[PDB]
Amino acid sequence: LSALPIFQASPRYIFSSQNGTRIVFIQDNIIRWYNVLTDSLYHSLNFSRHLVLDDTFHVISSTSGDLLCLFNDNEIFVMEVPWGYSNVEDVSIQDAFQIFHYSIDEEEPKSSIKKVLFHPKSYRDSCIVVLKEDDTITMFDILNSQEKPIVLNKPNNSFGLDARVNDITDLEFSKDGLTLYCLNTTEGGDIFAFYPFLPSVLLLNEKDLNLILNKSLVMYESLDSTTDVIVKRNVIKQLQFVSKLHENWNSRFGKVDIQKEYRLAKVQGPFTINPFPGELYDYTATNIATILIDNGQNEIVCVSFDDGSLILLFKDLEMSMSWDVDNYVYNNSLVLIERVKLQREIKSLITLPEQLGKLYVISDNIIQQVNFMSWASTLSKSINESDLNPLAGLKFESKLEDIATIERIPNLAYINWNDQSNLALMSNKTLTFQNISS
């Protein structure tokens, strides 16, 4: 209901957490947080004293909803939403909520920040991934200064084509939690990947820990003598590593520590995109998104293109982890399932964890929702039931649907209110709510 106290106003952001149960609202450099099932009043924490925002800043929230990351091309701030506190007066207690800060000027030619993401599987959301104009990707441990940031995809002293991955436009984590997909532009658009891309303390539940252990065992058995020597090495390394994880995994916290040695990994790619649409050779890839299909880490990779087109991809081969190998390719395979031409300028892709097989595409004045659960639901059934038959006949067409007309790329948020899931569309000038089916 747009008639909730936390919403009334006078840069604006809004985020939700725990199945649209908790709301976070940013306005006038003040954080407002309200738990729909727990509080009777909302609370605030004015942070102007620490940071005054300008329309140039981007702010994202950890999925857990416990942390906010505010950043621009020069600096990064990480604040803790005071869930549980009610009267945040103590100037000393309010500074406690300022958890981490970073400026590029902190380094001795300084590349500016292009994008920031929380690592989806870091314990206590303690890891932020930073992509710079550099095409350099860095991981900072928000909770530990006794940790020197890790820099991956460092520049090379090479000449010629493809020394390392250059011209990265977007980043996106696989729903597996251990893989980082990169969309670059050097040649019109390609996909690379860091596997594994681990934080310093990995969030891993028992179900997931056994899933990668078993996948690791299946590949180890899959080894024969024709197998490439470099591949054989990686597969064995993967099994050794995943086994060591299993040995130090803390079941009560569902976490495991990861030594700096295992975190330096070299990019894999480019991935093969089969069959690649001929038209697209004349355009450039814009964004990449990952959409969950079921509850077993099965996902669809989505990529944007200049022509207002979308290609829904599926990874058929199992990758092996790699750390040294340069230009390692191997089972770096993606298959095209469908192409969606929206004939509109796609400005961004967004997903809400609470809704499987659905993707929001923000064009120029519309927010459309591509819904591919028509076929995706069957696709996961066959993957899980090892039966290809169902696929026969199925028309892989996604249901396109206009959500609303916008003017300024709005801020989205899923809000579960009184048995009715909704979508909050936030913009400089407005704050709209809309019903969502399912």
């Binding site: 078993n214 065992l217 299946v218 599926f314 058929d316 298959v335 095209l336 399932i337 993957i383 090892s386």
Partner: peptide, 26 residues
Amino acid sequence: GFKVVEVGLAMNTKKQIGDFFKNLNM
């Protein structure tokens, strides 16, 4: 783990599904 056969089967099914979509589009 146990589930190994189960996991290997799923991985193998995905390959088969890979060909399906390869030999579905031109």
